[PDB]
Assembly symmetry: C6
Amino acid sequence: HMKHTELRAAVLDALEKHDTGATFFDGRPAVFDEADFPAVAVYLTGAEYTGESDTWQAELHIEVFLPAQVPASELDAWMESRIYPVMSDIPALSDLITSMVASGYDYRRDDDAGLWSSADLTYVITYEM
Amino acid sequence: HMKHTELRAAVLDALEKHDTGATFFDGRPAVFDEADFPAVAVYLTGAEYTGEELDSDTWQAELHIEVFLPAQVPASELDAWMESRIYPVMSDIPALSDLITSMVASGYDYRRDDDAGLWSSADLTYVITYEM
Amino acid sequence: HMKHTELRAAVLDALEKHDTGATFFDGRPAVFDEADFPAVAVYLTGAEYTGESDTWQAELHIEVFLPAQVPASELDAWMESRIYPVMSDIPALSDLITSMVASGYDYRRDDDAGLWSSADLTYVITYEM
Amino acid sequence: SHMKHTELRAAVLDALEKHDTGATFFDGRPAVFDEADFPAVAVYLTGAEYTGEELDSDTWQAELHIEVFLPAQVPASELDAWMESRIYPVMSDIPALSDLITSMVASGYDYRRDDDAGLWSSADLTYVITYEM
Amino acid sequence: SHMKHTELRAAVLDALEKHDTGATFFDGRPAVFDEADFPAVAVYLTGAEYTGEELDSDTWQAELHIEVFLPAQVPASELDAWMESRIYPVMSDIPALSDLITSMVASGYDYRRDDDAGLWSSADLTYVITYEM
Amino acid sequence: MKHTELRAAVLDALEKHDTGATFFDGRPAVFDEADFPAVAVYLTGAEYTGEELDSDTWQAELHIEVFLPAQVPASELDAWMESRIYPVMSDIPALSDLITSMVASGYDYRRDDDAGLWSSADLTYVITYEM
């Protein structure tokens, strides 16, 4: 297919392999269903062409969702337990990109509805389409 | 007749010739109809005169080729439509190149319907230069 | 009257003498009568004092409105055959200003009710109050 | 015995009112508008701020507004017509305003609207002035 | 035993309450008022931050506000009058405030209104101050 | 990961000190009229800053926010900080052990823009640490 699908699939596959207690999403969902939590979504944002070469740059997210009123440690625990480790070595993803560096780690919330709470892990990557 | 119409047109023709399963739009649409999905919109944003350093009719705009589908679909659905129906056509469109002076990939953004959450899309953008 | 009334009046007169199809408005309106369509408005934005003789600057807008249903080409077509031709030479306007240059061409919508759809042609002009 | 800002706006309202009192004059920009106050004129200041900082001086700088309000459906020419007649001309020679400031220069002329409801329409004439408190 | 911020706002509030007794005061910026209470005066801080890192100092910096509130439609000069006969005379000389800070300079004078309701209008006088916790 | 150990070290040290507050791990959005006084410890802006030839260095903003009803005088918030929060932040070995540096940042007074149900003082420090 095109590069973006491969990228998310490589991350989604590795994350799905071990952990077996979460609903995975390809792209960042808008609404949820109780049965979806714990939810984990892998997606891209800000993808853009770079050249002044065929290099593109994007922000890779792996976000964990849980019911609104849950303590930060719940999200962190899921992250430090079923995600962060996987992200250390993913040969599949590696073969598809030219580079990857840690970026941020944000705690987010359901802006209006207030139905969910989350932890968004982000890496900056560069690749060829 | 005006340069913009010729521009949109060329891309729309090349696109709707290769395929025939999508509903094509000339300009970005606000409201959508389930029946229209998968929809493809071709339009321009930010067109401005750039030659005040003396360059005749030298404008610059952002060319959009955005694909639409229902809000629920995964990012792959969109990418799949892009990769199979759009992206290829885009590599070679003589009709187009003969109208502009330059074109370079810009962005690829995943957008959604913030207003009602009815659709989801992938906006492919290019930066072009051309004489009016 | 101040230079602004003369500026707008000149464009309006030249536009209505060349093509009678539209319904001209002096200044940008918000509410529109479904009948007004096709509507055309001539107006100024960003009028500011520039210096040393009282040099000013402003953005001249010539925005044509049509119903939302309409595809972009219908807007482009109106411009190409009824507005643009005219803008190339308006001696009355030329006598009022010191300089004009093309600026932008934007497609705008009605965000409050979504009843109309437009194309907004803009030039930058310098003149003396 | 009055605050500088008051004396400043007052000198302006005094001059404008000498040529017309058919309009309803405001001291400050009105938030809500009463259809019966049309036509209305508002004199006010925005951005007032101490400037003598760096050079060590008791100089303030602010923006002086003189805005004309009319019903929303009116053509831009009508707003200008009121300005050319009773306002713009008065602005070039208000001695009482001079004796209060240290400098004045034209800044802008903007056409504004009632974004919230849509009851009024306007033209706002602004100057940048400097003065001491 | 008392935080610096409390001492700062208290030096001003006491001076104001002392200058003219019986008036309405607020320690922090309120959002709702009661007709009777007007004119209300509020003294508060915003933007307080530690600024001694790039140079190894104990300095903090914050914007000191003394804002006067009145009904939403009063002419702006009414707000200025309170400032002129209550606030400025006091701010001109407050030893207790001086003893608590290291510097103070005039900053701005803004006219603000009730955005969520439109029940009041105000005049916010601000000073930039630096001090030590 | 650090984050949990970071907020824990701070939360723990604060609870041993005073017992009259409802502590939250992370910034809450809706409170119960009975959770006041509330204290929340959380992080924002955590971002990667590079490798120190030994590990990955990060930077985040550490928040300690005390919440009280909307009408309380600003003095009530300050007094709560002065007596129950500052004395603790002055020295928390468990925390000092987890980070590579800490410096005071700001002290903001915040409000419940939506319902006007509360008032707060948000104390923040900029910290650096290895993940």
